[PDB]
Design an enzyme around this catalytic site. Structure first.
Site, PDB file in Angstrom:
ATOM      1  N   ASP A   1       0.667  -1.411   0.155  1.00  0.00           N
ATOM      2  CA  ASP A   1       0.156   0.457   0.179  1.00  0.00           C
ATOM      3  C   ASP A   1       0.863   0.841   0.145  1.00  0.00           C
ATOM      4  O   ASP A   1       1.719   1.616  -0.503  1.00  0.00           O
ATOM      5  CB  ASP A   1      -0.677  -0.071   1.530  1.00  0.00           C
TER       6      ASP A   1
ATOM      7  N   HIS B   1      -3.526   4.746   4.807  1.00  0.00           N
ATOM      8  CA  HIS B   1      -4.416   3.573   4.057  1.00  0.00           C
ATOM      9  C   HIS B   1      -3.255   2.180   4.224  1.00  0.00           C
ATOM     10  O   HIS B   1      -4.228   1.303   5.304  1.00  0.00           O
ATOM     11  CB  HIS B   1      -3.988   3.364   2.334  1.00  0.00           C
TER      12      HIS B   1
ATOM     13  N   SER C   1     -11.134  -2.071   0.656  1.00  0.00           N
ATOM     14  CA  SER C   1     -10.177  -2.167   2.093  1.00  0.00           C
ATOM     15  C   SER C   1      -9.980  -2.801   2.729  1.00  0.00           C
ATOM     16  O   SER C   1      -8.425  -2.923   3.067  1.00  0.00           O
ATOM     17  CB  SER C   1      -8.712  -1.034   1.953  1.00  0.00           C
TER      18      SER C   1
END
Ligand SMILES: *[C@@H]1O[C@H](CO[C@H]2O[C@@H](C)[C@@H](O)[C@@H](O)[C@@H]2O)[C@@H](O[C@@H]2O[C@H](CO)[C@@H](O[C@@H]3O[C@H](CO[C@H]4O[C@H](CO)[C@@H](O)[C@H](O)[C@@H]4O[C@@H]4O[C@H](CO)[C@@H](O)[C@H](O)[C@H]4NC(C)=O)[C@@H](O)[C@H](O[C@H]4O[C@H](CO)[C@@H](O[C@@H]5O[C@H](CO)[C@@H](O[C@@H]6O[C@H](CO)[C@H](O)[C@H](O)[C@H]6O)[C@H](O)[C@H]5NC(C)=O)[C@H](O)[C@@H]4O[C@@H]4O[C@H](CO)[C@@H](O[C@@H]5O[C@H](CO)[C@H](O)[C@H](O)[C@H]5O)[C@H](O)[C@H]4NC(C)=O)[C@@H]3O)[C@H](O)[C@H]2NC(C)=O)[C@H](O)[C@H]1NC(C)=O
Ligand SMILES: *[C@@H]1O[C@H](CO)[C@@H](O)[C@H](O)[C@H]1NC(C)=O
Ligand SMILES: [Ca+2]
Ligand SMILES: [Ca+2]
Ligand SMILES: [Ca+2]
Ligand SMILES: [Ca+2]
Ligand SMILES: [Ca+2]
Ligand SMILES: [Ca+2]
Ligand SMILES: [Ca+2]
Ligand SMILES: [Ca+2]
Lengths: 468, 4, 470, 467, 467, 4, 4, 4
Positions: C45, C86, C260
Site C-alpha cells: 500500500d 491506508h 480495503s
C-alpha cells in the site's frame, strides 16, 4: 569397440563426424553410450511423416498431435510442391533411425520423435500455447524452426497464452525440471534482420540456435543478435555441403538448409545430454551449452571475450555445440542454485534520443535483498521508445565488466515509426559475470538523416544466482 | 509465422 | 481455558466477535490455538507506521520495503489530510497487537506484519512487480487493497512484469507452495463498476474479497462480478458499525471502510489457516475458501446454486469467510492434484453482436489429453470484440451444468469504443463442476440504442484437475 | 521574333519543348512575353543551394528561410549521399536561370526563386505552419514535393496549425487573392497508394499534380485518386527521358524523377499564368487548370467524361498542363463569384458495410439558402467508419450527373483496423456540374475475406458558386 | 429629448437603467440615437418563440432556421417543463420590443432578432457548423449560450467543420468584416470549472462573456479563466435581482439566470456599437471591448494591472461592458492594422513536470519577419502533456512585461489521465503588450499526492500587429 | 514526412 | 492505481 | 452540449 552407423548417407553427414574434426563431435557421445535412449523430442512445425521408413522406428504418438485439425494424427498435408516437408526434415535430423540401410541417422538416433502439426493454418496464440504445452511430462525437448517473418521489418513475439505456456513449461514441465525449448534463430540475414526482434528466439525460456557453414563461415541467411546461445552446422554457399535428412514422400534429401536444420541438430545433442543426466533443469542445460560450446574454427568479425574469459559472437553465441563435451560435463553436473530475478528501473523520466544517447547507471543488483545476484544468467534491457525511423537505430548495452552487447543493429528495411513498447532485448553475453557496477545503454542514429525520438522507459532485468 |  | 483479548476496542470489533454471532468466527480459531504464530503478512500500500503502539510488537522489517523511494524503510509520508494512512489501517486489521491495552486486535494478532510503500508515487509495472515479488520465501501472504480506477469506465490489469511476478510468486513463493495474494474487489459500486474489468481481482492468482455490511447487506460501494471468491464484513450505511484499526499518527480509528478493510481481514483469516497447516498450496487455500465460506445471513438478490450444490453470489462469491471452519478443514487437508490447463478455441470466424448474440459449443475439456479436466477450478472466457458503447454490453457464460456466470454487467458510465482485447473474464462460480458438455456465451445490448460490434475471438481456458485415487 | 534559350541542356528538356507536340507547351507562353517576371516562388523542402550557378541569378532571400534551424539561410546540409538535394532540384525546374550557358532553364526562368528548409529534421505541425505561411504577401506560389509516407498503409494530413496556415494563406495571402499551394501527388504507386489518403494533396487549398512519362504513360510511382487536378511530365521507365535541373554541389542533373519533378514544373507554369494576370485568386487558378488542361496523348484506362463534357482520369486529373492555353485564358478571365459552402448530413444513423453498402440521398444543394450551389468546385465526402481491414475497402461517389469518382481504391498493404475518422475524401471530377439531384456513395469489400465494419457518418460538403 | 422605455417591466431591468448608476450604461447609448436599427442578431440555441408578443415586432426569418429539423421555422418544441425556453429568453434580452406595453425591452430594442434551433437534438459537428455559418452576410452577430458540459471534468471544443465555420465566418462574414460570435463563458463555477477547457469560449474568434451579480460580486456559477474578455450583469444569490426577459408561452420572466443571460446582453451592446459604426471588423470589436470595459465596482480577489496599465481579472476579463463608451469610441475608430500570427516552438526536449516545472524562453516575436508583432492581441499557449491526475495541475503563463495569466487553475473533479493534446490555452490579458522578451510557463501539482507526467510540446502562438 |  |  |  563402438561401431558407427552403417546407413548409406551417414558418410554424407559431414557435420556429425567427418574426420577433419570439424563437426558436432557426436560420435564421441555415441561411443560413451549416449544415443537418446529414453528421451522424447517433439517437432513443432507443419507435421511429421510418421510412416517414413527412417522415422517410423522412433515415431512416438505421445509426442505428436495435430493442433491445426484438432486431431491426434500429425501427418503432413501433401501438396504438389511438397510445401509441408518442413517438419519431417527436422524430425529426421533429431532421430532418424540408425543402421537400417535407409538415408542417414539422427543425432539422437535412439530417441523417440514426435511431431506437432501447427503451422499449416492460422497460427493463433491458442495454437502456439497448445503446441508449446503438449505433454509437458512426456516430451522432454521441443524443437521449433519457425517464428515471425524474417523480412527485417517486423518486431513480434509470443502473445498472452503462448507467454504463459513458456513459463508454465519451464516451471512444471518434466516434473518440474522444465521443458526444454530449442529455437532456430532466423533466416533473415539477407534482409539484415536481428533475432532480438523475434520474441521467441529472444526469450530466456528458449535456447536460440544459429548456423555456421561447412567451412565455418557466417551463412548468408544468418541473423546476428545477443540472445543467441550456441551454433550448429547447416547449409552455406553453393560450394558447401548441406544437411542430410528424411524428406516428404518417404524420400531422403541432402539439401536441407537454413537455421531450421540447426535447431533440430541442437535438440538431438540436447537429447544425448539428457540421457547422460536426466535431472538437468532447463537452466542447467543452458549453463552446459555456455560452458562447452566451441568458438574454434568458426569465423566471425565480432568474437569478443566477456568478463569471465569466454569468447562470444553475435553470430554464434558461445560457439559450436560439442556433443562430447556436453555429455561429459552433464554426467557430474551439480544442479544450479535457485534463480534470482532482479528488476531495476534505470529511468522513467524521458530522455531525448536525437543523434545519440547514452544512459549510465550504477547498479547494486539487489544487494541486501533476496534477489541479490552475483553471477548473471540472462539479462533483459526493457525499452520503450519512440523514433521516426526504427531501422536506423543501433542499441548497445555494456556490462560493468565491459562486455558490450549489441541489443539491436541497424535494419535498413525497417521504416516503422512505432518504436518499441516494453520490448525486452535479451543478451546471453554477460553470462556468469557479476552485475554489480555501472551499466551503460547506448542508442544511436546510424543514419545521416536528422532522425528523432524519445526513450521513455529503460528497465534492466537481471536473472542469475547468489555467490558460489 | 514462417517456417525456417 | 481461552481468554479473549482484553484490548479496549475489542468489544467494538463486532465482526471479530459479536453478541449476535454474525461475525468472522475467529474466536473459535483462536481458542484452538491459532493466532498467526510463525506467519508473515505484508501490506502492499502507501506504507506502514512501523512504530505504531499497536503494530510495533508484530512489525517485521523483512516483510517491508519502500519501493517508491528504493529504501528499506516503509514509513508513510505524513500530510495534512493524512492521505497515506491506508497501509497502516490495513496492517492493524491483520496483526494489531493483542492484550496490550491499546486499540483493538488483528485477526492474526500473533503474526508478523510488514508493509511495502509502493502507492505513494508513480505506480509503474516494475514497482508492482517488485512489490508482489518481495521476499517470496519470507512473506507468506500479500494483502493488496488497491487497483485500477473504480470509476466504472476503465478496463486495466497487470502489465508484463507484474503478470510475471504473479505467476512466479504462485510457482516459486513459499518454497514452491505459492505466494498467497489477497485482493480487495473494489469500491466502484456507486458507479456500477464490475470487478471483472479489474485484472488484479480478476486474476486467478489472487483471492478477490468483497464486503458485507454489519446487517448482512451489499455495501453501497460493492462491485459485483464472477471472479470474487469470498466476503468479509466491512462498513455499510450510516446506521451500521465500521472497522476498528490502527490509524496514522499512532491513533486508533473505528471508521475504516470499503473493500480495503475486507482484504486484510481475509489475509488475517488466511494467516490463521496457514498456521493450522503450513503446507497448503496457493490453490489449496482457494479450495478451502470455496468449501468453508458461508452464504448464511448475507442478503443478495442473486444467490444461485451451482452444479455441485453450492450457493454463489456475484456480490459475495461463496459467502462470508469462516475462520473456525477454515482452520478446521485445513489441519488434515490433502493437497490437491496437479493443476491442468485446457485451452479451447470456441470461435475463429467473426460474429456480429448486434442486439444479441449467443455462442454455443460442445466442449470435451481436453478428453484423451494430459490436460483433461473433470473438476473445474478457475474458468476464463477470453474475449476480443469491438463495440461502439462498451458499457451497454452484458456478457454471460453458462456452464454445461447450468451455472450462469455474469462475466460483465452493464456499466452506464463506460462509453469506450475500444471494446476488449483478449480480456480474460474469469468466473469462480463453476468451481468443482465437470466442464464436459455444452458451454454458452451470451452477449447482449442492454440499451435501446442502435449499438453495433463484432466478437472476433472467444477462447475458453479451463483450469482444474481429474478425479484420481490411485 | 522570339529567341529560345541557348542553355547547353535546354535541348534535353524534352518536356519544355520538342519536335513532337508532347510537351508542356511553355515556348508558346514565353513567346507571348511571359517568363515569370515579378513572380515569386518558394520551394518548401530540404533547403536550396542559393549560390548555385543556375539559381543565384533568381535567388530571393525574401522567399527563403530555414525553419529547421530558425535562421534565414536556407542552405542545404551537405552529406556524401547528397540526401538534401531535393529542394535544389525542385528550384531549378521552377526558375533555373536562362541563357547563361549553364545547365538548362526553369519554366519561369525570370521569376524569383526561394527555398524553405523544413524537412531536414522533425517536421512538426508548427514547422509546416511556419513554412506554408512564410511571407504571404511576398511569395505568390509555394511548391511542396513531400507528404505522408507513401507506403500505401498510412492516412495522415495537416494538423491544427498547418490546417490554419492553409486557410489563412488562401484567405489573406497575396493581399487577399490567396496563396497558391502546388503539391506533388505522391510516389506510392508501386505500393498501390491512394493520394486521397494524403491530407495535403487531398486538400482543396492545394493543386495536387500527378506525373506522366515521356511516352504519355502512367508512371510506375504514380498514385491514383480523385483529388488530383492536373499533370505534368516526369520520369518513367528505363527507356524514357527524365527531368533536367540544378543539383547539389553546383552540378546539373538529367535524372530528376518522381512527382517531385512535376509539382515544381506546375508551379513554374502557374507563375507564367500569374504574370499574365496578377489578379487571379487561388480559386481562379484552379479553374484555369481545369479548363485548359489536356487529356490528349496521356494514356490511361480510366478516362471518363463528366457531366459538363470534360474528360477526367484518376491518374491525371484533367490532363496535362498547357502553359500556352493557361496564359491565354488568364488574360481574358473574369474572377469567379464568391465561394459558397453547402454542408449536408447524408446519414447520422449507423450502417453495416458488410460486403457492400450503397447510400443514396436526394440533395437540393442548399436551395433557398445563401449557400445554394449550381456550379460545383471541390466536393468532399466526409466519412467516419470502422472496418477490420481498411485496405480491402473501395469507396465511390457518384454525382447526380453520373460522374463516378473513386474516393478510395483498394490498398493491399493497408491492414489497419482504425478505419476513418471524419476523413474528407475529395473529388475534383464534378467540377462545374450542378450538384442538385441524387448522390450515391458506394463502399465495398474488394476481398473474399470475411471483413466487417460500420459507416457511422457521411457528410457531403459541396463547394461552388451560383450564377 | 430622448424618452426612456415605457414598458411595464423596464423599471425592473436594473442592469439597463438604474439610479444606482451601477449598470450597463445603455440609456446613454440610446439617447445618442443607437438602439440597433439595421443590425441583425441571431440566437443559436433551442429555438425562438417568433410569435412572442415582445419579439414578433423584431423577429427576422432571415436570421433564423431549424437545423435540428432541417426546416426554416425555429419555433421551440413545447414540453410540460418548458425545457426549450432557453433561446426565447436570450432573444428577449437582445431585442425585446420597446414601448409596446409588454414585459421589458432588449438592449438593442430596434434590432432584428432571429433564432437557430440547433440544441434540441444531437448537436453534431455539422449542426454547429451550419448554425455558426448561417447567413454570414445577413446576420451580423451570433449569440451562443451553450458549450461543453460544465462539470469541471471535461476538455472539449469545436470539431473540424465548426472550426472551419468559425474561421470562415470571421474572414468572410459581414462582407469580409467578420461575423461576431458572442459566447457565454460557462456556469460550472460550483464545480470549479475553468473556461479555458471550453474550446468555444477559449477561441479567439469569440467574445467570451462572464457575469457579475447585482452587487458586483462573482456569481456562484462563474468560471474563471484568462480567455474571458468582458462582463455583463446577471443573476446572483437569493438577495440579488435577476434578468427580465421574454419566456416561453408568451410569458414574461424576471428570473433568467447564469452566463446565458450575460452573452445576449453583450450581443445587444455590440449591436448598438455596430449601428454606431457598421465598418468595425471582428477584431475592431474586441479592441473596443478591451478599451471601454470598466473594472470599477466589480469585486474580485484577482484584479491585476497588465503591461499597458489596464486592470484585468480572470473572473471579469477587462470588466463590465459600457454601452455608452462602446458607442462613443466606435464612432471615431480607425480599423486596426492587418493581423499578424507569430508561431514559436518553445521546447527543445521533453520536460518532467513532477511537482513543479518552469519553462523560460526568450522570444523575439518574429523580429525581421512579416509576422513581427509589437502589439499583442490574443495569445495561445499550445500544450501537449501527459499527467496522471489532470485536475491537480495549475498552469500559468507570464508575459515579458510581467502579466501572469492563469491558463488553468485546479479542477478538483477532474481525474482524467488523458492530459492535453495540443490544447490552445488562450489569454486576453496581455492585449496590447509588446511580446518581445522572456516568456515563462509554469506548471505545478497543486496536490500533496505524488503525481507525475511529462510536457512534450509547448508552442506559443502570438496574434497582433506592428506599427 | 517524406520527400518526393 | 487507487487505494481501496 | 449544454445550455447556459
Ligand atoms: C487430524 O489428524 C490428527 C493426527 O493424524 C493422524 O490421525 C490418525 C487417527 C490417522 O488418521 C493417521 O494416519 C494420522 O496421521 C488427529 O489426531 C489423532 O486423533 C485421534 C483421535 O481420533 C487420536 O487417537 C485417540 O487417542 C486417544 C488418546 O489420547 C492421546 O493423546 C493423549 C494426550 O492428550 C495421550 O496421553 C494419549 O496417550 C494419546 O496419545 C497418542 O497415542 C498414540 C498411540 O496410540 C500416538 O501414536 C500419538 O502420537 C499420541 N498423540 C497424542 C494425541 O498424544 C485415545 O483415547 C483414543 O483411543 C480410543 O479409541 C481407539 C480407537 O477408536 C481405541 O483403540 C483400540 O485400542 C485397543 C487397545 O486397548 C485395540 O485392541 C488391541 O488390538 C490389537 C490388534 O492389533 C490386538 O488384538 C490387541 O490384543 C488388542 O488389545 C483396538 O484394536 C483399538 N481399536 C482401534 C479402532 O484402533 C482405544 O481403545 C480407545 O477407546 C476408548 O477407550 C476408553 C477407555 O477404555 C473408553 O472409555 C470408557 O468407556 C467405557 C465403556 O465401557 C465407560 O464409558 C468409561 O466411563 C469410559 O472411560 C472409550 O469409550 C473408547 N472409545 C473408543 C473410540 O473405542 C485414540 O487412540 C490420536 O492420538 C491423534 N493423533 C495425533 C497425532 O494427535 C486429529 O484428530 C485430526 N483432526 C481432525 C481435523 O479430525
Ligand atoms: C535424479 O533424481 C532422482 C530423484 O528424483 C534420483 O533418484 C536419481 O538417481 C537421479 N538421477 C540422475 C541421473 O541424476
Ligand atoms: Ca537411417
Ligand atoms: Ca528474424
Ligand atoms: Ca491492541
Ligand atoms: Ca473496480
Ligand atoms: Ca541555365
Ligand atoms: Ca501517397
Ligand atoms: Ca416590451
Ligand atoms: Ca465550463
Amino acid at each position: 569397440v563402438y561401431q558407427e552407423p552403417t546407413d548409406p548417407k551417414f558418410p554424407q553427414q559431414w557435420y556429425l563426424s567427418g574426420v577433419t574434426q570439424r563437426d558436432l563431435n557426436v560420435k564421441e557421445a555415441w561411443a560413451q553410450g549416449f544415443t537418446g535412449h529414453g528421451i522424447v523430442v517433439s517437432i513443432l512445425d507443419d507435421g511429421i511423416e510418421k510412416n517414413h521408413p527412417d522415422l517410423a522406428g522412433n515415431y512416438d504418438p505421445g509426442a505428436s498431435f495435430d493442433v491445426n485439425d484438432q486431431d491426434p494424427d500429425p501427418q503432413p498435408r501433401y501438396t504438389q510442391m511438397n510445401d509441408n516437408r518442413h517438419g519431417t526434415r527436422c524430425a529426421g535430423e533429431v532421430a532418424a533411425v540408425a543402421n537400417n540401410g535407409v538415408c542417414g541417422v539422427g543425432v539422437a538416433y535412439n530417441a523417440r520423435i514426435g511431431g506437432v502439426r501447427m503451422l499449416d493454418g492460422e497460427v493463433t496464440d491458442a495454437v502456439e500455447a497448445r503446441s508449446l504445452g503438449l505433454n509437458p511430462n512426456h516430451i522432454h525437448i521441443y524443437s521449433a524452426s519457425w517464428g515471425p517473418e524474417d523480412d527485417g521489418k517486423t518486431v513480434d513475439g509470443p502473445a498472452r497464452l503462448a507467454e504463459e505456456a513458456f513459463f508454465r513449461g519451464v516451471s512444471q514441465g518434466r516434473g518440474g525440471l522444465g521443458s526444454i525449448f530449442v529455437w532456430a534463430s532466423g533466416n533473415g540475414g539477407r534482409e539484415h534482420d536481428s533475432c532480438n526482434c523475434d520474441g521467441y528466439t529472444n526469450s530466456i525460456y528458449t535456447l536460440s540456435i544459429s548456423s555456421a557453414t561447412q567451412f565455418g563461415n557466417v551463412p548468408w541467411y544468418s541473423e546476428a543478435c545477443s540472445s543467441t546461445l550456441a551454433t550448429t552446422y547447416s547449409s552455406g554457399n553453393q560450394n558447401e555441403k548441406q544437411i542430410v535428412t528424411t524428406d516428404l514422400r518417404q524420400k531422403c534429401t541432402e539439401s536441407h538448409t537454413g537455421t531450421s536444420a540447426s535447431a533440430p541438430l541442437a535438440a538431438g545433442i540436447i537429447a544425448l545430454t539428457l540421457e547422460a543426466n536426466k535431472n538437468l533443469t532447463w537452466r542447467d542445460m543452458q549453463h552446459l551449452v555456455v560452458q562447452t560450446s566451441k568458438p574454434a574454427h568458426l569465423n566471425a568479425d565480432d568474437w569478443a571475450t566477456n568478463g569471465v574469459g569466454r569468447k562470444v559472437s553475435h553470430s554464434y553465441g558461445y560457439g559450436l555445440l560439442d556433443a562430447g563435451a556436453m555429455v561429459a560435463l552433464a554426467q557430474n553436473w551439480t544442479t544450479v542454485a535457485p534463480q534470482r530475478k532482479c528488476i531495476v528501473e534505470i529511468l522513467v523520466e524521458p530522455k531525448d534520443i536525437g543523434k545519440r544517447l547514452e544512459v549510465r547507471k550504477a547498479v547494486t543488483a539487489c544487494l541486501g535483498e533476496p534477489n541479490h545476484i552475483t553471477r548473471l544468467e540472462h539479462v533483459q534491457a526493457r525499452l520503450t521508445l519512440s523514433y521516426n525511423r526504427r531501422g536506423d537505430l543501433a542499441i548497445h548495452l555494456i556490462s560493468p565488466m565491459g562486455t558490450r552487447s549489441t541489443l539491436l543493429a541497424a535494419r535498413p528495411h525497417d521504416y516503422s515509426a512505432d518504436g518499441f513498447n516494453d520490448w525486452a532485448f535479451m543478451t546471453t553475453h554477460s553470462w556468469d559475470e557479476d552485475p554489480a557496477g555501472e551499466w551503460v545503454l547506448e542508442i544511436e542514429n546510424t543514419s545521416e538523416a536528422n532522425n528523432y525520438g524519445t526513450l521513455t522507459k529503460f528497465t534492466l532485468v537481471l536473472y542469475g544466482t547468489a555467490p558460489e | 509465422r514462417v517456417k525456417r
